[PDB]
Design a binder for this molecule. Structure first.
Ligand SMILES: Nc1nc2c(ncn2[C@@H]2O[C@H](COP(=O)(O)OP(=O)(O)OP(=O)(O)O)[C@@H](O)[C@H]2O)c(=O)[nH]1
Ligand SMILES: [Mg+2]
Ligand SMILES: [Mg+2]
Lengths: 273, 135, 62, 102, 51, 237, 389
RNA sequence: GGGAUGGCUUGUGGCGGCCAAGCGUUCAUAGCGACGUCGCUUUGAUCCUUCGAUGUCGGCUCUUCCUAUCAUACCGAAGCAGAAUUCGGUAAGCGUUGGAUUGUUCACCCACUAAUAGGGAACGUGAGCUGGGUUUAGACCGUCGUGAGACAGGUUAGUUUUACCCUACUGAUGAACUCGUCGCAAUGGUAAUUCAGCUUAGUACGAGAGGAACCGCUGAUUCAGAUAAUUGGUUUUUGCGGUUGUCCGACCGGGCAGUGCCGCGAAGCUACCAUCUGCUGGAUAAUGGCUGAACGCCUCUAAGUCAGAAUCCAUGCCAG
RNA sequence: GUAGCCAAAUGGAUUAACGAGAUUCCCACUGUCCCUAUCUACUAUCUAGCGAAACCACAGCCAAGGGAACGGGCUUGGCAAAAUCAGCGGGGAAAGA
RNA sequence: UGGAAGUCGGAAUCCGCUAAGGACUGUGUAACAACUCACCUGCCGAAUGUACUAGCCCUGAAAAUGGAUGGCGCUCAAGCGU
């Protein structure tokens, strides 16, 4: 197995995580709206339920602009049975849910007015939008934001108000023995530039995305399998090697990057009640 | 038993670790990427290398996806580097090529395209049975 | 592996020398000696039979 | 020390047959020749000792990160080795039983 | 082979089972090269009539 | 082969012809061999051999004494308590350890250096001994955290022994009452030798004269937790 | 601290110092042990390296993959004109080693061996051994007789003095090579009588050595001059544009002693080293007067061992020659010392008999394709200068 | 202006109780106490609990040493049938590799292999080369401060540049003894290594599955020393030929473009990219014995003595 | 909502072009490497002429000991033979250190 | 106990005949048998056995360039005690 799929499981990253947990009173667990139960960290939830009941865990469903509003409301309804959930589109210029999240943090600070301040640490998978949430709450680009996973390598304090601190943390991936490298790559753990044979994960993308969405995305139709799809995409876009041979590897890397970066429409439907 | 064959005279090793050679049988693979050589020694900084008739450990880079994610034993049957046989003849083929086998030496495929080398033919009796030209 | 200086290897080589290579080298030496025989054959004081004296020190000088 | 203990205990655990995976004839034959409960309890004690040795090693490495002198480091090392030795010492009877079974 | 040194020592005679017109020719040194020419390329059973 | 095949071969064919004689001669040479080992082994092998021989000699002396002596519970317990494994069971209000070694602040604290320059600030202090941080503990932020109590040095349970009952139970630590070296060490919760701690004694089965259940008592730490990796305490009764 | 990855040492300490040889002619350090039950024989000989060529051999090696097949092998030709025996040295045993008691010379010595005793022979009066030659005539050789009796009754090791006939070689050198050759076998009296019988006589190479024998070759290697560590010891080159040099050793020292070790690879003299290489098989001893000595039983081309156009930088081989499988320590024109093997052989390769099928006599001055000039003319045909002549 | 713990360490926990040969005490029957023992620290599971850089490491090249031995040699024991091993002993002669991974204490994985053992000579401060701790001057973000600025921090770019001296080392000459030829050998160095195949033999052994070994033979790995017949490489052989631009009026024959460029190219040098070669005696260690006392049995040991490891010392080999 | 409603086509900062800015990857390419070899010019080399400087208490082979963890001079050993040339970078010297 | 006879186990462990002999110290059998030990007698022939104490000697842990009772060397000392 490639060493890139072990990213997010490092001793340094988990030392950073436990440092943030020990230093934080409120823990914002950030979920991808396209895969909430996929991005949920029941490992950290079990640790918080077992060892630190005094720390307040709050769900933040980020990237709700990439999913239908009905599915977002259903996922909020599912998660609010366990923990208080806030939907948010993290952006400096055009945010959503910023006022509700600010009000909830102000309520927590009012509850802990005996302290000098409260600390709110952000946890989740890589590339779920933790730095974007901090930047959107501050209204100013204070934390680095990139579509490349693992942009945040160390923890960082940002002073939100006089009594509210925000703690940015690197993204963690808890180890699961039923998790596959294809599952991790589709969740967004790794960079597809550093993976070998990207073509094999294209059937997973074609399963997750409806066919007509791919048709309007790439203005292409008539493929019977992923190899033909990548070949016609390479010939259309001009991704050719020496002799006009298609650049199927590079086209697959482009498709995987567009799938992760919210350019091809896909979501996981909420389970019906 | 390991894949290194006995009774093999010394010849020039033309394929070090990292070489991509053609896949000369019909197993489904188009090329083999060499990651190791059976019977290689131990020197600092020296890449392991193989010649015609050697068993190597190979990875399929182009071919069927079923063959893609495994390491296969392969036998080098053709090489481009010129080597000498005991009758004084230096010779070489126009490409480097090998066939996928099992650790005992039975072939994965059913037929061989192109000729095979003599050294491969004596050292592996299944390749001698599946070769149309021995050359 | 057994080294070159191994006692069992030495005994193996001694048996080989005594039983196998020995007679062959002896016959060759006999033939060469015979050939070089073919090539080679192809008062006491006043006669030199009594070996007289020819015409740093170990002691202290005295 | 923990790596050596884990290697030996894992070899013992993986080498013995798994009664849940056997054919009914072989499983019931081992249940007749050997007590199946005793067999499973002995191997469970082996696995428990292996896990506890790993836990003790992790705890004492974490303490040795903060140890400040050679005397304190030596006391922590001897403490870890003695606790692992005590864990092995409580396994006197399962090892004899498993050697006879082997 | 066992009576004559064993495997790896015994030297087999390949010309013993040759079938020739005269068995005295079974251990001849057959000429192969003569003045830059292959003798086998010039071997012809009806050489006398052509000569 | 199957079942006891070496014993069956033993029945059918026996030993080698010199097996008994060689074994007898080896058993005879054992005395010379043991003295040669006692005089010629070197180092750790010799030390282990000496301790083993000492143990065998003591065991042999005990066996001989028992054989010479062959020709010649304690506390009253009811019938349902007979044949079970039971403990042996053996003003100035002074603790068992009234005085310990004093620990200076230079030994207690090490300086954590901060800054990117060659000259670095030194205001942060790190506690080098085990601590009890209490429940509902949230760490101070790094800009206002002077005293660093690392997570791997924090403890929550202790092996507390009751002297009268001779029972040692692992009990949760409730608080740190008095560290003998410094009230700052008491405030930081440092667990050292001679420290008076408050322990949860619910598992010990202690009731008061009024019938109320006593679930908090005082124990004294009787070891060095930084050297031992564990907290051992004795109840003050 | 310890070196992280183990690696075997570059070069051997058995061949130190890597300095020039003290003498151009190779020294026989040891002779085979003397067995008095053997008949008297000579243990060494000299020749001149002429060059190399190719053969085809019908291999009879049971157990090998090339058994009953033809193998192409490289061989070295040594031109061996017969030596002349001119002297006899007696050696005694002392608690300080072997000691030369006396030596006896022949009545007549050649000019080429008298040249060895001079540096300016052309200006010389050539008086060497002239007063010695009168000892054979005075008193019927009484002094010669008493020296022979002294060797007979006091000595244990007898060596002849033998020199080469360098005038039969194409070399421009006229000064011959003189060496001591031990007489092994027999009693000391037999050795003395044998040497006196061999005085002033030529000894050919085929009465000292025989085909299928494995011998030792002693010679001085090709000189390379002053050579850096990379070629001299085989060290790994430093990366490209390394400061202060890349064909160097990065650390001659990094530890105590505060010194440079004798075991550290350093630049210096490479080549011109004295070497004794053992176990070389003789494939043919060809005769000088035989005109078809490069012919075999299956190659009926009647030709000599000299390649077409001659040996490059040597000339023609006109005397008896020895064909040796493989390579020898020296170079062309160089004196070679052939010696008997010190011990009885332990291989089947020494017991193998050689059957040559063909010997390459094509030109080594290029890509020669013809074995004889008649073959070249037969392939080419009639040329313009043929009709012009 | 002033500076830059150590005959330490190793393999076996701590606290509390009990027992305890013994030391003591036997006007007090207390107190120390090895060996032990007892209490605390999942029916082969779970995988939904990774718990703090103030202390900084590396890589290359290359040499040597230690043994606390992974492999190779020999040996002792084990239900060790065989095969494969496990535990231990003598042993450092000889080896101990190739890679992926920096969203990071770079340590874990993968394969080849006989095996991929661990350390020192720095790290008890410290000029061979080069990446990180690491930090002059430029700049940005985060935290703190009203601010100059400082830092919990994160990112980016950034000047030390010997050797011709002494010694050591590697090579090369040399006065004195007339010049030269042939020698000896004190002393110093020292070298080979591992695997596979054939036969034994589908035999011993085994219910079956399977499955050896000594003797003999043939190759290969790693190392070492040479060599250039052949095959590749290299071309100022500017040897021959082709070709662009320009110049000598054209042709011929040439110049220039620092070897104009290109094809072949002898010779020389070179490459496990080519070929050849690498050798035998004595004494031992662990152990296994013979004879035989101590000690009327017994005993490989005490006197005497046999055999035995890749070990030691030499020969073969290099210097002289 | 497998893609809705409301707003004057769009719902954007996931901002195009530009860059001796920093980073990852693919094809091609190759002496970066396996694993080194060869050729040319200028040096280095030797000669004629010309001709400095840095630096310099005195000097220069090691081993063990020399309490103040330091020896080059002391003690005890090993040893130890004129005068030299080309190189090397261990040590001493040597960084406007 | 399938079998268990002193000798796979659990618990008892007595008497007779005795010169003396365990409800057995080991080897052995499927169990027996058989051998052996504890103990006794005959032969022999004069001093021994056990446990401690004090001297001297060996072991009672060692790394890494080649070296140190100062060096040679020393064994009824040129070591140790008077
Ligand atoms: N469509 C959409 N994209 C978002 C939103 N929030 C964040 N993103 C994108 O998600 C990407 C990854 O999130 P980040 O801002 O890097 O935060 P993160 O989850 O901590 O990622 P890491 O720092 O790598 O761990 C960013 O490039 C944003 O552009 C959102 O609300 N909607
Ligand atoms: Mg982030
Ligand atoms: Mg990111």
């Amino acid at each position: 197995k490639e060493a890139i799929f072990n990213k997010g499981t490092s001793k340094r990253i988990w030392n950073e995580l436990y440092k943030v947990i020990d230093s934080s009173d409120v823990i914002l667990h950030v979920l991808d709206a396209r895969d909430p139960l996929g991005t949920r960290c029941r490992h950290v939830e079990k640790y918080l339920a077992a060892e630190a009941p005094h720390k307040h865990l709050v769900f933040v469903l980020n990237k709700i602009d990439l999913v239908p509003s009905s599915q977002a409301a259903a996922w909020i309804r599912i998660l609010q049975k366990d923990h208080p959930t806030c939907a948010m589109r993290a952006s400096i210029t055009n945010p959503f849910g910023r006022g509700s999240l600010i009000d909830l943090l102000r309520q927590f600070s009012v509850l802990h007015k005996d302290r000098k301040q409260i600390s709110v640490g952000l946890i989740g998978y890589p590339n779920v939008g933790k730095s974007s949430i901090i930047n959107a709450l501050r209204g100013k680009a204070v934390a680095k934001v990139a579509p490349i996973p693992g942009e945040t390598k160390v923890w960082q304090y940002v002073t939100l108000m006089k009594r509210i601190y925000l703690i940015d943390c690197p993204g963690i991936v808890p180890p699961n023995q039923h998790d596959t490298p294809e599952d991790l790559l589709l969740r967004g753990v790794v960079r597809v530039e550093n993976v070998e044979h990207p073509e094999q994960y294209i059937p997973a993308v074609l399963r997750k995305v409806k066919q007509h969405h791919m048709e309007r995305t790439y203005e292409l139709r008539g493929w019977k399998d992923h190899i033909e799809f990548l070949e016609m995409l390479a010939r259309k876009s001009g991704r050719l090697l020496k002799g006009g041979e298609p650049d199927v590897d590079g086209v697959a890397k482009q498709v995987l990057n567009d799938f992760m970066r919210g350019k091809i429409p896909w979501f996981t439907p909420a389970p019906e009640p | 038993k390991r894949g290194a064959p006995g009774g093999k005279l010394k010849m020039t090793l033309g394929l070090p670790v990292g070489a991509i050679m053609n896949c000369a049988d019909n197993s489904g693979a188009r090329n083999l990427y060499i990651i190791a050589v059976k019977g290689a020694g131990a020197r600092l900084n020296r890449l392991p290398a193989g010649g015609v008739g050697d068993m190597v450990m190979a990875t399929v880079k182009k071919g069927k996806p079923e063959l893609r994610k495994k390491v296969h034993p392969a036998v080098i049957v053709r090489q481009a580097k010129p080597w000498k046989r005991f009758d004084g003849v230096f010779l070489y083929f126009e490409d480097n090529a090998g066939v996928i086998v099992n650790p005992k030496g039975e072939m994965k495929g059913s037929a061989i395209t192109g000729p095979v080398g003599k050294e491969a033919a004596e050292l592996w009796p299944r390749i001698a049975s599946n070769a149309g030209v021995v050359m | 592996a057994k080294s070159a200086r191994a006692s069992r290897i030495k005994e193996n080589h001694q048996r080989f020398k005594k039983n196998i290579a020995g007679p062959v080298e002896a016959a060759r030496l006999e033939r060469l000696s015979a050939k070089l025989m073919a090539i080679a054959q192809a008062s006491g004081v006043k006669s030199g039979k009594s070996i007289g004296r020819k015409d740093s020190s170990i002691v202290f000088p005295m | 020390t923990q790596e050596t203990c884990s290697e030996k205990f894992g070899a013992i655990i993986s080498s013995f047959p798994v009664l849940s995976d056997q054919h009914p004839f072989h499983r019931d034959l081992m249940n007749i020749l050997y007590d199946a409960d005793h067999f499973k309890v002995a191997l469970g004690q082996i696995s428990t000792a292996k896990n506890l040795i790993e836990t003790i090693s992790r705890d004492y490495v974490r303490l040795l990160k903060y140890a400040q002198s050679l005397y304190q480091c030596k006391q922590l090392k001897r403490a870890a080795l003695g606790r692992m030795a005590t864990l092995i010492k409580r396994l006197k009877d399962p090892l004899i039983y498993l050697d006879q079974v082997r | 082979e066992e009576a004559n040194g064993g495997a790896g020592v015994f030297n087999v005679d390949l010309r013993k089972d040759w079938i020739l017109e005269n068995p005295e020719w079974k251990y001849d040194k057959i000429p192969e090269i003569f003045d830059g020419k292959n003798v086998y390329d010039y071997i012809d059973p009806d050489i006398d009539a052509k000569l | 082969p199957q079942n006891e095949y070496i014993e069956r071969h033993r029945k059918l064919h026996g030993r080698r012809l010199d097996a008994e004689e060689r074994a007898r001669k080896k058993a005879a040479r054992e005395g010379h061999k043991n003295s040669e080992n006692a005089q010629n082994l070197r180092g750790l092998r010799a030390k282990l051999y000496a301790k083993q021989r000492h143990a065998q000699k003591i065991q042999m002396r005990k066996a001989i004494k028992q054989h010479e002596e062959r020709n010649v519970p304690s506390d009253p317990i009811p019938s349902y308590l007979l044949d079970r494994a039971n403990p042996t069971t053996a003003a100035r209000f002074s603790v068992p350890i009234p005085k310990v070694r004093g620990i200076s602040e230079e030994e207690m604290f090490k300086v954590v250096k901060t800054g990117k320059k060659t000259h670095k600030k030194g205001w942060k202090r790190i506690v080098t001994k085990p601590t009890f941080v209490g429940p509902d503990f949230t760490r101070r932020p790094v800009k206002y955290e002077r005293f660093i109590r690392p997570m791997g040095l924090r403890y929550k349970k202790a092996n507390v022994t009751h002297p009268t009952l001779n029972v040692t139970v692992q009990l949760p630590i409730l608080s740190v009452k008095k560290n003998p070296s410094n009230p700052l060490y008491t405030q930081l919760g440092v667990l050292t030798k001679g420290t008076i701690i408050e322990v949860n004694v619910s598992d010990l089965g202690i009731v008061t004269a009024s019938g109320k259940i006593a679930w908090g008592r005082y124990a004294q730490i009787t070891n060095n937790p930084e050297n031992d990796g564990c907290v051992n305490a004795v109840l003050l009764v | 601290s310890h070196r992280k990855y183990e690696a075997p040492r570059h070069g051997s300490l058995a061949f130190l110092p890597r300095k020039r040889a003290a003498r151009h002619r190779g020294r026989v350090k040891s002779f085979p042990k003397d067995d008095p039950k053997k008949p008297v024989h000579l243990t060494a000989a000299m020749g001149y390296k002429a060059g190399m060529t190719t053969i085809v051999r019908d291999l009879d090696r049971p157990g090998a993959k090339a058994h009953k097949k033809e193998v192409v092998e490289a061989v070295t030709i040594i031109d061996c004109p017969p030596m002349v025996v001119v002297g006899l040295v007696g050696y005694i045993e002392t608690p300080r080693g072997l000691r030369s008691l006396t030596t006896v010379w022949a009545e007549h010595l050649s000019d080429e061996v008298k040249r060895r005793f001079y540096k300016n022979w052309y200006k010389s009066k050539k008086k060497a051994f002239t007063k010695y030659a009168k000892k054979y005539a005075e008193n019927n050789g009484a002094s010669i007789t008493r020296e022979l009796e002294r060797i007979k009754k006091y000595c244990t090791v007898v060596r002849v003095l033998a020199h080469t006939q360098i005038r039969k070689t194409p070399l421009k050198q006229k000064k011959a090579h003189l060496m001591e050759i031990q007489i092994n076998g027999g009693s000391v009296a037999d050795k003395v009588e044998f040497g006196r019988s061999l005085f002033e006589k030529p000894v050919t190479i085929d009465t000292i050595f025989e085909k299928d024998e494995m011998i030792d070759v002693i010679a001085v290697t090709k000189g390379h001059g002053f050579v850096g560590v990379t070629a001299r010891w085989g060290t790994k080159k430093l990366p490209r544009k390394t400061h202060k040099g890349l064909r160097k050793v990065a650390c001659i020292g990094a530890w105590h002693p505060s010194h440079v070790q004798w075991t550290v690879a350093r630049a210096g003299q490479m080549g011109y080293h004295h070497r004794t290489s053992v176990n070389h098989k003789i494939y043919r001893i060809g005769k000088g007067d035989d005109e078809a000595n490069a012919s075999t039983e299956t190659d009926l081309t009647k030709k000599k061992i000299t390649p077409m156009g001659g040996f490059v930088r040597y000339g023609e081989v006109n005397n008896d020659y020895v064909m040796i499988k493989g390579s020898v320590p020296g170079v062309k024109k160089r004196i070679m010392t052939l010696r008997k093997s010190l011990f009885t052989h332990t291989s089947r390769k020494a017991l193998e008999k050689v059957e040559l099928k063909w010997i390459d006599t094509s030109s080594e001055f290029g890509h020669g394709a013809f074995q004889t000039a008649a073959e070249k003319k037969q392939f080419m045909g009639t040329l313009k200068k043929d009709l012009q002549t």
